[PDB]
């Protein structure tokens, strides 16, 4: 769920 | 636009030609899956990685144009659209403007409007020039125009050519390319000739 939809 | 108008007026290449000119499963980042035989790619959700794909076909002569469809919700921090030679890297282990950060790639950051070619980042020219601080927005679809007779790379938005972003491309074999950072982003390429 990081800024770039990566978790 | 006279030669471009003649290219775009012609019947569009069919499914077979679009696939042969689409994304290459054998020349894309290890984190990218090419779908529908080249019509689009999906980048898997990997952290701190910028990943790119190259078209199956390199152009060194004539006029070539392709439509990139890239949804706004799937661009993230660095969405770059452009071209590259066959030796440009297709992966890096951080979030960056990969396409255009070396001598082998040329790209337009469609989020910031900056042009990259052998560029680190700061001081990159704005495209269209003179639009910094105007908060422009590149829509979902965009046309990429490579003129190998004149050695230029340009872009068209809503049927309007923005002019050449890059020049001095003659003698090179250039491939459609993009670099993405967004987990599960799907980028379509629709080749239109010549």
């Amino acid at each position: 769920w990081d800024i770039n939809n990566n978790x | 636009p006279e030669g471009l108008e003649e290219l775009l007026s012609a019947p569009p290449p069919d499914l077979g030609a679009q696939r042969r000119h689409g994304w290459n499963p054998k020349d894309c980042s290890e984190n990218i899956e090419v779908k529908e035989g080249g019509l689009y790619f999906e980048r898997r959700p990997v952290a701190q990685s910028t990943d790119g794909a190259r078209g199956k076909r390199g152009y060194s002569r004539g006029l070539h144009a392709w439509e990139i469809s890239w949804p706004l919700e799937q661009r993230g921090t660095h969405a770059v659209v452009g071209v590259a030679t066959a030796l440009a890297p297709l992966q890096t282990d951080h979030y960056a403007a990969l396409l255009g950060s070396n001598s082998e790639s040329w790209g337009w950051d469609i989020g910031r409007g900056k042009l990259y070619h052998q560029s680190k980042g700061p001081g990159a020219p704005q495209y269209p020039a003179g639009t910094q601080g105007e908060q422009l927005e590149v829509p979902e679809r965009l046309l990429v125009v490579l003129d190998m007779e004149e050695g230029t790379l340009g872009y068209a938005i809503g049927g309007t050519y923005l002019g050449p972003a890059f020049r001095g491309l003659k003698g090179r074999t250039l491939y459609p390319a993009v670099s993405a950072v967004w987990g599960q982003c799907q980028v379509r390429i629709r080749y239109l000739g010549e």
Side-chain angles (χ1 to χ4, degrees), chain A, chain B residues 1 3-72 74-119 121-194:
Chain A
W1 58 94
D2 84 345
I3 191 168
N4 284 317
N5 195 48
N6 297 303
Chain B
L4 187 57
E5 199 271 5
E6 289 156 309
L7 188 151
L8 297 167
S9 289
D14 59 22
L15 184 65
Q18 281 177 67
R19 277 177 169 153
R20 288 190 304 273
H21 288 257
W23 304 124
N24 195 342
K26 317 266 186 62
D27 198 12
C28 69
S29 153
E30 58 175 321
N31 302 314
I32 279 167
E33 204 209 316
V34 173
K35 309 263 199 69
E36 292 195 82
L39 299 199
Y40 80 94
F41 75 73
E42 179 163 343
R43 181 204 171 270
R44 76 171 180 96
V46 226
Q48 316 294 313
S49 173
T50 304
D51 307 80
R54 249 186 304 261
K56 294 163 177 163
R57 295 282 273 277
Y59 317 118
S60 50
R61 293 298 303 258
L63 194 58
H64 305 273
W66 59 90
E67 185 196 75
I68 292 294
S69 293
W70 200 330
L72 319 192
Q74 295 175 27
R75 292 167 180 194
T77 64
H78 310 79
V80 202
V81 182
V83 298
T85 75
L87 287 168
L90 301 163
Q91 207 266 332
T92 200
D93 297 307
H94 55 100
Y95 292 134
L98 176 54
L99 189 73
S101 71
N102 48 61
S103 54
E104 303 310 308
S105 51
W106 295 252
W108 186 26
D109 183 307
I110 54 156
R112 304 174 174 89
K114 276 178 169 69
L115 294 174
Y116 301 102
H117 180 51
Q118 331 171 262
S119 302
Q126 209 54 46
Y127 177 81
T131 61
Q132 209 170 65
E134 307 299 90
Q135 273 165 303
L136 303 200
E137 244 175 73
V138 171
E140 171 159 311
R141 300 188 278 269
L142 73 151
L143 183 72
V144 192
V145 192
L146 190 67
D147 183 357
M148 287 310 282
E149 287 316 293
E150 287 294 316
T152 69
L153 171 68
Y155 301 83
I157 289 159
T160 308
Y161 191 59
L162 310 191
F166 303 98
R167 332 182 86 104
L169 305 174
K170 296 162 194 165
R172 285 174 162 118
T173 306
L174 303 167
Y175 298 84
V178 293
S179 60
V181 300
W182 189 263
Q184 304 179 106
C185 71
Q186 293 168 345
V187 187
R188 309 207 130 243
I189 184 171
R190 183 175 66 103
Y191 178 76
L192 290 149
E194 75 162 291

